[PDB]
Design a protein around this ligand. Structure first.
Ligand SMILES: O=[N+]([O-])c1ccc2[nH]nnc2c1
Ligand SMILES: O=[N+]([O-])c1ccc2[nH]nnc2c1
Lengths: 303, 300
């Protein structure tokens, strides 16, 4: 009884506990069974990234994304998408563009095409990811360099037009400490963009922790919430060593922040992690729930 | 771990290979183990029809391109497939009822895939899983609509597109010499080749339950009696992964002159299509399992 973290988190008033996946996870291991039972939202591990979806200008690849969207619909799961504008996994045809009008239109087309395809089916998009340097200045990607800092407002405005139903998020990593310049900076810039009417509905904190860093998220998450977005989230969570303590502290940070809609982990089982040697996830290599999973369950159960 | 690929090459074979794809290469320890221990890679999913031509004339090559490029960069041989198969088949194909229309759809798919990687692919599986367990031909959309001759056409079309690729009809349940399916594919391939159909190979999609490794020692020589220049063991996995089934498996290949190699159907057990049986050669912690160490000792 009372072993789904998603079901338990919803009972506490949150939207979901989610997980990244894709077609070949769904067809292998025990991923599909675990997601069916335990998780309420799925995100494309890779199939919606720019290198996967638009490998040459205007030529899109949607087989993988479609597979995930369909599976999520068939299994009654919410679906997230992203990242629409991101410097990593970004084809060389984009990064070679030097003309402002041409990159603006290429960016807008990428956004619009993905969001239109899935219009009305996607809870939330990560519209812009990893836009910040560690010092809090904006990262000098092709977007910044060629379009300028208006590429962020343009990306969100384009997204809202493409699918007004989706929650639109900015996401970044190393927003885990409240004193860190990057944390402070994304709040200040998101406040300013929202004051200019940019439709930033959420800040997503891509939470990749080392052992003992869970505690600090209890202060960093409320600070992100202070930017005034309707939502914030913990995304792509993983924790080197998968201490119960670190995991429960992240969880509780979300519970404590009224605008935090949920938490997503960056895969199901350790061996399928990008950092497997750190065993950073909630299920082991035999697909058994780990102590951290059980400690989340106890944390979320109610009297 | 000592490399089963290098050891099998030392025994005169071409390769010991493995199925993989982009997201395996960027997670777990898969890239490192493939680099060290395997000499050929196959696309787990990225060259299947559903992945590559999800609507008519709309091709998706990013995933396949990634694999091909990784293989080149790391000095690995590459295989492709499956070009004609009833599983992971878009409904736009299976809904076709006209003979010419489907013949042309089948040809265009084959040609477009094989032409993009021309010269890079050691071997294609042109046809897979074409047989019923009783040895008759599986009543797929291609047999129902185009007829028997779909198999000859598929092989023929494959040769024109890349004359340097080894062409392999493939099937499963070819694991026992006494099984009707095994004798059946041998007879048909003999006749197709007599008529000049360019079938260079038969591959044995070898999905075994416990204890079935022993029978491969007679089934593979029977497959090789069809007279193809090559045969292979493909997509190998064995429920329970005991050393007996797999060594016994390593040795069927070694005993059959025309067998070019063996490929396993993934690296580590949790990434198997069947994982609770812990049936591959590396465990959920990416350790080499007793069956990997037994293969190494057998090949030394
Ligand atoms: O929470 N996630 O693990 C996760 C994974 C991939 C994504 N792409 N866009 N948002 C994403 C979220
Ligand atoms: O040996 N293989 O594991 C393997 C995997 C996928 C394939 N597709 N076509 N032939 C294939 C062989």
């Amino acid at each position: 009884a009372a072993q789904s973290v998603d079901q338990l988190i919803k009972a506490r008033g949150k939207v979901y506990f989610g997980v990244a996946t894709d077609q070949n996870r769904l067809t292998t291991g025990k991923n599909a069974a675990i997601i069916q039972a335990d998780f309420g939202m799925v995100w494309p591990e890779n199939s919606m990234k720019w290198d996967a979806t638009e490998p040459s200008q205007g030529n899109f690849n949607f087989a993988g994304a479609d597979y995930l969207v369909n599976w999520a619909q068939q299994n009654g799961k919410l679906i997230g998408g992203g990242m629409l504008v991101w410097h990593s996994q970004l084809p060389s045809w984009v990064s070679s563009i030097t003309d402002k009008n041409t990159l603006t239109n290429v960016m807008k087309n990428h956004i619009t095409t993905l969001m239109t395809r899935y219009k009305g089916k996607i809870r939330a998009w990560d519209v812009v990811g990893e836009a910040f340097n560690e010092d809090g200045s904006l990262r000098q990607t092709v977007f910044l360099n060629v379009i300028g800092e208006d590429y962020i407002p343009i990306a969100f405005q384009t997204a809202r037009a493409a699918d007004p139903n989706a929650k639109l998020y900015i996401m970044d990593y190393n927003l885990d400490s409240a004193s860190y310049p990057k944390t402070q900076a994304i709040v200040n810039r998101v406040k300013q963009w929202r004051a200019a009417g940019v439709p930033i509905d959420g800040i997503g904190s891509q939470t990749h922790l080392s052992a003992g860093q869970g505690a600090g998220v209890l202060q960093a998450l409320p600070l992100l919430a202070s930017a005034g977005t309707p939502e914030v989230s913990i995304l792509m969570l993983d924790v080197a060593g998968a201490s119960p303590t670190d995991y429960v502290n992240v969880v509780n940070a979300c519970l404590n922040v009224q605008s935090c809609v949920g938490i997503s982990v960056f895969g199901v089982a350790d061996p399928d992690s990008w950092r497997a040697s750190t065993t950073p996830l909630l299920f082991d290599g035999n697909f058994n729930p780990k102590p951290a999973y059980n400690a989340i369950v106890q944390d979320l159960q109610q009297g």
